[PDB]
Amino acid sequence: FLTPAQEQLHQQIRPMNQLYPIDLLTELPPPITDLTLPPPPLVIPPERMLVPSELSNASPDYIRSTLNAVPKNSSLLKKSKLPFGLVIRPYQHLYDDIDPPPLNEDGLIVRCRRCRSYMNPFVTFIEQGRRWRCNFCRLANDVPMQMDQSDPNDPKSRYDRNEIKCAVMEYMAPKEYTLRQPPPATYCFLIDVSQSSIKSGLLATTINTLLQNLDSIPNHDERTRISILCVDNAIHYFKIPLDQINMMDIADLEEPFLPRPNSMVVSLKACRQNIETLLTKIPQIFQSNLITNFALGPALKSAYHLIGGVGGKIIVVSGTLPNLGIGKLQRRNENTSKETAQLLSCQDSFYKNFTIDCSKVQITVDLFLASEDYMDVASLSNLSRFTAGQTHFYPGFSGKNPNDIVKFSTEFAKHISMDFCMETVMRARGSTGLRMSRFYGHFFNRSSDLCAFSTMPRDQSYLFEVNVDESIMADYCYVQVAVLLSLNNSQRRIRIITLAMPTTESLAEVYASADQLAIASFYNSKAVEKALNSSLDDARVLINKSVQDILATYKKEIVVSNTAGGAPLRLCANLRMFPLLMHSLTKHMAFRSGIVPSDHRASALNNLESLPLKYLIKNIYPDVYSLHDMADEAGLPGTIVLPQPINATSSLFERYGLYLIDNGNELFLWMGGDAVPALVFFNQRVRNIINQLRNHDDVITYQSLYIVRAREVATLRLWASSTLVEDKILNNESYREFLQIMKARISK
Amino acid sequence: DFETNEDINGVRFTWNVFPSTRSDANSNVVPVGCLYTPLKEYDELNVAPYNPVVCSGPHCKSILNPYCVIDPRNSSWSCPICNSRNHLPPQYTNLSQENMPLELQSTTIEYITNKPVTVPPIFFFVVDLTSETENLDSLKESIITSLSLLPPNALIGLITYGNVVQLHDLSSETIDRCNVFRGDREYQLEALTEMLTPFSLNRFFLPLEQVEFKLNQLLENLSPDQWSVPAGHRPLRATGSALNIASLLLQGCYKNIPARIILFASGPGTVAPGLIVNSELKDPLRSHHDIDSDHAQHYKKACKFYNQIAQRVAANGHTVDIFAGCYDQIGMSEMKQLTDSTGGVLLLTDAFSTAIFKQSYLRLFAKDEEGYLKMAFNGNMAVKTSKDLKVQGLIGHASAVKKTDANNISESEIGIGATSTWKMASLSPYHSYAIFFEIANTRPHLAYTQFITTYQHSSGTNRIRVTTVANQLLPFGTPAIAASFDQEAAAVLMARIAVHKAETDVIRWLDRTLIKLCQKYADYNKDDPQSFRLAPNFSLYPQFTYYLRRSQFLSVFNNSPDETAFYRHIFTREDTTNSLIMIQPTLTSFSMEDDPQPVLLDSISVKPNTILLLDTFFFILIYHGEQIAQWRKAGYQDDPQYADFKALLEEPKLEAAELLVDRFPLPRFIDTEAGGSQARFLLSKLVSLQNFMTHLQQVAVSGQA
Ligand SMILES: [Zn+2]
Ligand SMILES: [Zn+2]
C-alpha cells in the first residue's frame, strides 16, 4: 500500500507568381504529370505571420482557393471569367489516428469581439503585446493573460501555442460550447430482407461483414449504441438484452410507433455477446422469404423515432426498390430529351421532407443500394445528400459473382469503421470584402454561412463559392473555416482552418495563380447542380462555356501579339490541364450525351458532387499504366511503387501490350490481342500494383477489376474504350478537335 | 316433490300445476317458468352410445321419450310434443317391459351423437402487463399451473399487452417472436388479416404438446410493462384493443369453433378503444351515481364498444373470461356483456395473489370422473312444447338463435325472447337458465316440455342432453294449483326477472307482484290485516321478497359498478339452492352446549358465548362472540382437556369448508369477532322484516283499482 507521496518518492529515487505562356495546340500529348503538381504558391511574406513556418498558412490538403491571388475588386474578378471558390476538406483520413491536426486542450479559445473570428497566424499584436488586431475585421482586442501563463516569465510563450503556429489546428472546446452532453456514436442498421435481397445474397453478406467487423466499428468512449431493423412488408425490431433476444413484428405501416421503450438501441459493449447471437440468426429467420415488398418509408420513420432522441446514423442496406409504404416508388420511363425532369428529379417528395426532419433530431442517412434492378438512386440520394450521408450504388449485385461480395463487403466494412462527428456545424468567415454565397456538398444548409452536419464523415469534400464584394482595400485577404463538433469519443472540439491570400489588381497575376484543379472542381460542382435540377445539356453547355470564356478572355486580355508562332491556342501553364479536364467531364458518365441508366447517371452525379479533390480528378481523367514497359524498380518500395501514368488515348495502346486503366470506380486490365505468351506471367508486381490502387485510407472505395483482350469481349472493349477520354468517343469529339473547335469559336 | 324433479331432471318450476288458460296464468302473477340445469351432474346418468330417435312430424324434431305413446302391436310411438304417430324404428320393434330402450327408462338422458371432425378446445390467454411484479408474478404462477391441467392436445394462444398489444408466435423456433399492434387503434378483420398473413393465422394457435417448453419459458420470463408513467397518471392499458385483436384473429381462422378468450387485467382500460377512464389520476372511476346521472363520460362509448365485441364472439361462438386482479375497477360494468352473452367467467379480485383468484382460476379447469374437463362448449338449447304452451324467453348466459323454424314462440317476452332456441359458447354443470312459458289456451289435461341441449363435450364428442317433463293443467281455482307452488323457485325466477329488468321501480314491481300474489292466495277478511294467513307453502315468499329487494344485486347502494356486475353475473348463472343464499343469506349459531342452529338475520343472535357463520355465497364470514373470542384469543383450544372448546371453533370451519366444496367462484372468507373491523360486514346485514310483513298485510286485505 503506497500513498501518492510514496509513489513520487520511490520514483524520484513581393514574389508574385508569374504567367508562363503555352500553346494548348502544341501542348498535345497533354503533359498529364501536371495533374499531380501542387497549385501556384500562396505568396505570403514571413512578415504577415506571427511564427513563419510551413504550417502558418493553410495547406492545400485542407483548403484550396480556386484563386491564390485574389482580385482586389469585383470588376477585376468578373473580367477574369475565373471562379472564386474554396475546396474544403476538414478531415484527411477515415481514421482519426492518421495525421490529426495539432490539438489544444488548454480550453482557451480567443476570439474577436466583433467578427467572432478565431485567433490565428495572421493576427497582429499591438500595444506592447497587450492587444491583437483581427486580420478579419481589424478590431483591436485584449490579449487574455492565459495566453502568456504558459511560460509565466517567458514573454515568447504565446508564439508556442498551436493557434498561433498553425493555420490548421483544433481545440478542446470550453464548457459553454455544449448545451447537451456530447452524444455517443449511435447506429441503426435498416436492412432489406425481401426476396430479392435473399436471392442476391446481399443479406448474408451484410450480416457477415457486420458480424466480422463489430471490432472495426468505433467505440472510443465505449458508449457506442447500436440498433437493427430488418425490413420487408413489415418492420422487424429486436430487443437485445445485456450480456432474452426477441423479434417484434410490426406490419401497421401507417403511423410509426415503437414496440417497446428500450433494449433496441443498445451498448455495443455490454450487449456484444447477444448482438453477435442475433446477427447469427437473422439469415435463418429469413432464410426463405417469399415477400417482395420493402417498406423503406415506414422503416425510415420508425428509425427516426428509434434513434431520433439522441440522434445518429441510419445506415440502409437494400436490394429492393421502395415497394410498400409512404415513399414507394416505381420503375421510370426509360432517355435523352428532358431526362432530368423525369429520370433524375426526385419522384416521391417524402425523401426530401424526411431530410428536413432529420435536421431537427441530428440524424444522417447512408445507403447501400446493391441490386440488378432499378433502385431509383436518383431520388433516394436525396436522403444522404441532405443529411451529410452518402449513397453507394452496386450495379448487378448477386452472390453468383464472388467479387460483388468482395467489393460491397469491403466498402461496407470500411464505411462502418470510419469515424465521424455529431452535431457538427461548419462555418466559414471571410476577411473584409470576401463573402460566402453558395455552399456545395452533402449536408444541410438553408441559412447562408452555415452548413449543418447531423454527423460528419471523413471521405467527402465541400465547396464554398465566394464573392469579392466591391473591393478589398488591403494587400491580403483571409478566409476562416470553423467546425464546431462532437467527436465520437464524447468530446466537443473546434477545428479551425485559416487561409491568407495576396490581393492584386493584375489580371496577369490572377491567372498566374489559378488552381486549375480547384477550378475544375468548382465547375464540376456547378454542373452536378445543373444536371440534377435543370437540364442535362444546360450542364454540358456550362462545362464547355467555362472553357470557352476563359480561352477567350486570355486571348483578348492577356495575349500581346498575334505574331506568336503558328495560330496557337493561348493560355498559361497553371491552367494547362483545365481545358482537358472540362472536356473529359462532358465525356463522363454523369454528363454524357446519349443513353445511360437512370441509376448509373444519378450515382455518377452523386459521386462527382462529393468526391474528395484527389479522386474527383482520377474520375474525370483516368490513370492509365502500361505494364509491359513498366520500370523494374516498381513492385515494392511498405508502399508499393507505381508506374508513370500515360495519356488516356486509344493510340498509346500497343496491339501487344498490357495496360491498367483506373478511373476511380472500376479497374481495367487490357491485354493486347497479340502479346507474347509471357501472358502466363513479375506476377507479384501486377498483383501488387492492383492491391495498391485499391487500399486507400481516405475513402472506402473498392476497385472492381475488369480483364479484357464476340459480344461480351466487344462490350468490355467498348466500355474500357470509353474510359480514354482523349479520343473521339461516344460520338463526342476528340481532345484535339475540342481545342480545334474552341479556337475557331473564340477567334473572330 | 320439488326436490325430486330437480334431483332427477335438474328442473324446478315456479308452478308445478299450470293454469289452464292465459287469463289464469296472469292472475297468478308469478310466471309459469322453470330453472333448468342441462349439464347437471347425476350420480347415475344414462348415456346412449347412439343418436336419438327424432319425430317424423313436420316441423317437430322432438326426441322419443318416456311420455310417448308406445304401440308395440303396430310398433309405433306417438309424440307428446307435436302429436303424430311415428314408425318405431327397426331395432325397437321388440319393446317389452324388460326390453325398453334406454331413452324410455329416464326422463333425462344423454346421447353421444356424432363426433366433431374439428379442432380441439382453444385457450387464448390475454395478459395485461401493466401490473406490479408481485401481482404479475403470482399470475404467471397460476397460468403455468393451469397449463398442466389442460388436455395435451389443446390449442394455446398468447397475447401480452399494455401500451401496445403483442400477439405471440410459438411456431418459430429460430427466435421467439411476436406481431405488435397499436393499442390505440381499432383494427378491422380485413386489415388485421392482411397484416398477419407460416403465413396463416392458424400459427398463433398451437397444440400445448408441441410447445409446452417454449410457452413455459415464455410465461416464466414475463415482466411488467416498461413504459414511463407521468406525474399523476395511470399506466396506459389498451385492453379494448387487445380484446378486439383477440376476437378478430379467432374469427379469422376459428369461427364457430370452441375458443375461450381468457383476459387477465390489473386495472381499467386507459386507451381507446374501450376506454374506461383517462390516464390522469385526477379523473376518478365512475360510480353508480355518475352512471345514473349521465355524468359518466366514458361509460356509453365503452359499453357501446364492448357490446360490439360481445355480439361478435357470441355470433362466432367464442367465450370470453375476465379475471380482474386489482383493488380498483377495470370496467366489468362495461365489459360484462362479453361474459354474459357467452358462457364466460367474470371474477373480481383484489390481486392475482388472492386465494379467491388462485383457487377460482384453477377450479375453472376442474375435471369429471372420466378425467375430462367439466366445462362444455358450443351449447345449443331448444325448448319443444305441446300446443297449449309457448315460450317467452330465457334469462341466463346465452344468446338468441334466430331464423329457427320453431312455432312455439310467444308474442310476449321475458329476458332473451322472440325464440325458443338459445346458444352458449360455454356452459358447465354450474350453469342454470330460467325459461319462461305462456299458457297458450285462451278428463286429465297435460302439457309437455322437452329440453334438447346439444353441445360439445370435453371428451371430444358431440352429445345431446334431453329432459322431458309433463305438467297437468287445471281450471281456475283448483286447489292442486295453489299446492303446486314452489316458493323457492318462484322467488329465484322473480329475482332473475328483476336483475334482467334492472340490467335493462324494479322494487316497485317486486312489491306489486307480491301484493297481487298474496291477495289471490292469502286467506283473510277484507280490511282486517291481522287475519292475514299464507299457507306454509307460500309463507316464505314474502320473506324472500323482503330480502331480495335489499340484496347486493338489486339495491346497489354500497356497491361499485363492478361489484354489481360481478354479483349479477353469478346470480343469473347459479341454481335455486345457491340463488336463495344470494337473496336470503344464511346464519348459523354455534355454542358449547348446543348443535349448529339457524338464527334470525338480526342483532338478536349476536351473542358473547357463540360463534356465527354467515353465508352470502360471495362471502363466508365467521364471527366469534366476545367471550369465545377471548377464550380463543389465548389458549384453551390448544389444551387437550378443552377439546370441546376446540371442536366449537372448528365446527364453523368444517361447515365452511363443506360449502366451499364445489362452489364457484370461491367466496371471500372472513374470520372476525366482536371488535374486529370486519364485524361490520356481519352487522351491515343484520325497515325490518316485521314492518315489511305488517305493511304487507294491510295492503293485501285492501282493494286496488
Ligand atoms: Zn474581427
Ligand atoms: Zn312430434
Short mmCIF file of C-alpha atoms and ligand atoms in Angstrom, two decimals, chain B residues 54-63 77-86, ligand 2:
data_model
loop_
_atom_site.label_atom_id
_atom_site.label_comp_id
_atom_site.label_asym_id
_atom_site.label_seq_id
_atom_site.Cartn_x
_atom_site.Cartn_y
_atom_site.Cartn_z
CA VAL B 54 -86.43 -37.99 -33.79
CA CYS B 55 -90.08 -37.31 -34.55
CA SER B 56 -91.13 -37.51 -38.19
CA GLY B 57 -93.90 -34.95 -37.69
CA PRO B 58 -93.42 -31.92 -39.98
CA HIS B 59 -91.60 -29.13 -38.18
CA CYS B 60 -91.16 -31.10 -34.93
CA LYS B 61 -87.69 -32.51 -34.25
CA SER B 62 -88.65 -33.62 -30.75
CA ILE B 63 -86.96 -36.76 -29.41
CA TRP B 77 -94.89 -44.30 -30.98
CA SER B 78 -96.99 -41.15 -30.56
CA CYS B 79 -95.31 -37.80 -29.97
CA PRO B 80 -96.37 -35.80 -26.87
CA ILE B 81 -94.99 -32.53 -28.21
CA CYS B 82 -96.39 -32.38 -31.77
CA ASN B 83 -98.73 -35.41 -31.54
CA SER B 84 -98.13 -37.66 -34.53
CA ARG B 85 -97.71 -41.42 -34.86
CA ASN B 86 -94.21 -42.36 -35.90
ZN ZN C 2 -93.56 -34.59 -32.69
#
